[PDB]
Each structure stands twice: as C-alpha cells, then as structure tokens.
Amino acid sequence: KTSFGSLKDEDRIFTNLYGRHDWRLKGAQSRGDWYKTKEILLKGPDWILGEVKTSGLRGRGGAGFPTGLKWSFMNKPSDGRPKYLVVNADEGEPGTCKDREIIRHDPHKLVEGCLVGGRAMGARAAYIYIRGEFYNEASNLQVAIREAYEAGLIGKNACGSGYDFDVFVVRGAGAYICGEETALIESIEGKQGKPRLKPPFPADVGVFGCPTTVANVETVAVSPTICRRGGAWFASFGRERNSGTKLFNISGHVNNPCTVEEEMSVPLKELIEKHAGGVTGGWDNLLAVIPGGSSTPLIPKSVCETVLMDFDALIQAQTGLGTAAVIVMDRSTDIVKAIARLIEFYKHESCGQCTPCREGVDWMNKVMARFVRGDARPAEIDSLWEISKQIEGHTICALGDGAAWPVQGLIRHFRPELEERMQQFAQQH
C-alpha cells in the first residue's frame, strides 16, 4: 500500500459516532458490541495481549506508545495488592473532542473495552476518570454501566466467564493537568492533580499504590473489536508501525468542523477536504495547521500539502500526531495571537509543582504577550527559543514539553512575522 484514507463504513469501529442510533445496550448489541465477550475472556490474558500486540495499536491519548507492550507490564503474578485499570477520559487537550463522542454515543464499547482490557491486565476493576465538565456524558456512561451490571456483563461472573470486574466512574473538578497519567492517579486518590516522578512506573506502584495501567478512552474502546476481528485486520490499515483507524477532530477555519473516523496515514489535505469541506476561503487561504492538538508544533501550508497523518510522518515534519486533533488557521489569522493564547492556556493549567514549568511557562507567556503587540526586540526571539529548551526535558511531566513545542513551532516557521511586528511597533514609537 502507498495510499491510505478511503475507509469503508464496514471497517469503521465507532459506528454510532454521531448518535443517530440507540446509544444504550439494545442498540449497542445490535451493532456488534458485547458479542462473544465470554469467549474472549476465556482465551486468557496472553491471547488478548497477543491480539493487541499484533494489531500494532498505539496510545491514542497523545503519546502514541505501543499499547500491547504497555499493557504487558501488568501480566505478572499477583503480589497481594489489587490490580486496576484506569481509563483516561479527562480530554483536556485544546482541539480534542473525540473521547467525548465515544463516552456519550458508544458507552458500551468503552465498558466492554474496560472488561477486555482489564482481563488482559488481571485487574479487578476499572476506574474511568472523566473530566467534571462532561456531566451529561458521565451520566450516559453511568446509565450504560447500570445496564451492563443488570445483564451480568460486568460485576460478579462477568459475561459468565467467572471473572469478577467492577467499573467505577470518577469525575474530575477542572484541571487539564489531570489528564497526565500520574496526575490522574493522584487526583483519584484525593490530592491535587500533581504528577509523580518516574520510577516507580504505574505498572508497579499506581493508584492507591497498586499496579495500574492508564489507558486513553479511544485506546480502550477499540480493544474488543481488535479481539473479535483480530489484530491482522486492524494492522491492514495505515503504514507499518502506524496501524489502524483513528478519530480526527477538524476545527478552526474549515467550512464544516467535525469529528470523523478515518484511516491512519491519510493525507492531511485529503482529510480536510473530504470530511471538513475544505479550508474556509479555499486551500490557498490556508496559513498553518496544528495537526495533533495544542501541544504539537504548527506546520505551515507548504508542509500541509503532502504530510500524512500518522506518528512517523508528522515526526519527520517536526511535529506529532498527538491526539489527532487538527486545528486549521487561514491567512486571516493573527498567528502570533493564536499561539500566545495557547501559551496562556498552558499558563493556566500548569500544576506549579516543578520549577521550569511553574516559572518558565509563566515567563514564556509574558514574552509572548509582548510579541503579539510587537513590543520587543529581535534578539528576544532567540532568548525565547533558548528559554523553551530549558523547560523541555527538565520538568517532571510532559506539560512542560507541551508548552515549549508550540512556541518552537511558531519561531521555526513564522520568525519573519514576529520580526515584522517588532518593526511596526518600533516605527510607531
């Protein structure tokens, strides 16, 4: 294969993405959910982990780590502590709204994924951490969980397999940092959402100090279908090491902003015009695209022409797939103001635990505010670049990196705009 991105409906996983069919148990079963769940559970964790591995699935939460290998850290003899699966539904990355649709329109896929993924890990229960703003979405998930409990699909003797499994829903209280896996765990434990240093890794010491795996909603929700249809089916989509289908969010300056499922490695231009109805004002009006949520560096129009949407392709473009949330900016956008607002976002979300982000991100925010008005000198651009490199790789968690990268992207591709603004301000003062 050389071309990707004409996914057929029969190959789509989230078939109620738009909520046009009954999201409840009766509709979910009619669409293939919960089918032969007992057989999957009886195959054993090694078979389930084997399927997840051969599918080439990678983390859909933004970091893209191989799921099969990650989940295998939990396949070990019990040492007396309970084992837990924590499903990350915090969905805080600006531009990203995919996990919201799964939770409210395909909740039973997430619940079944919790049971199947939990079985492979040997977990006794799944804690679903959903952000507190998603109140109606959380209630839908709770309604679905009650339906599954009453049909015996979860709880004692889940699906008749003799495996006891509970699914808990825990709501956040308004913190983007609580999407970070260790901050999420600390939040579940009743503390501030401040990340943990590693080691220990969560698979050894996690929620309540117990072996734990944190998985994104989308990563979990697809696992039952990978088991039913097989890893080879999943691995037949997208490039090698970039397998499967993916939920994309196309927001910003597009004619029809939308969420859609498409194959991995589809061209970015193909995605924006086939599904979102093209760029506002046409493709020639495109200025820049943030390809994977606010934490991934922007790329200009030239790069957008032929870049594919997968982990490897976007890395070579000096960015990343991230959450696959595409934010589109046309030529009428104040690009400096757009990025400054993201830095302001990271300033408001930093937990404040560690020095480079507590002080550095707030510092970068102040510099960006002056850059928007042009009230600076060109020498400060290289200073700002150097400051961002002192944050990246020196913080406890990746929020520090996620604040540096947007700044680096702007300087990389839009330095003359920054310098032009400075000239205007100096000319007028």
Partner: protein, 56 residues
C-alpha cells in the same frame, strides 16, 4: 600668561627656550569641570542568547 614682553624676552634668553609656548601653568586649554553625561558600553557577555556561563 601676563608677563610683560620685556620679561618674556629676558626669561626666554636666560633659559635659552621659548618658555611661552609650553608654560607649566594651566589656563583655559584644560577640560571643562562640568562634562556631559557618559553612556558607557557593555561587555561581550551582555547577550540574550548563546551566552551560557559554562562556555565562558
């Protein structure tokens, strides 16, 4: 500066020099005792980047 012309000749002849051209007493050739403010330059470590102390 105010010596009579005769006295200038006498001390010039006695010394054998043109003393009047290099008087040891200072008059108005010296700098004013009030000067404009300076604006002093800064050293080569006054930079906003590429200036890590471990390299200097």
């Amino acid at each position: 500066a105010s010596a009579t012309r005769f006295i200038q000749w006498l001390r010039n002849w006695a010394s054998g020099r043109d003393l009047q051209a290099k008087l040891q007493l200072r008059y108005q050739e010296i700098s004013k005792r009030t000067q404009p403010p300076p604006k002093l330059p800064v050293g080569p470590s006054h930079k906003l980047s590429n200036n890590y102390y471990c390299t200097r």
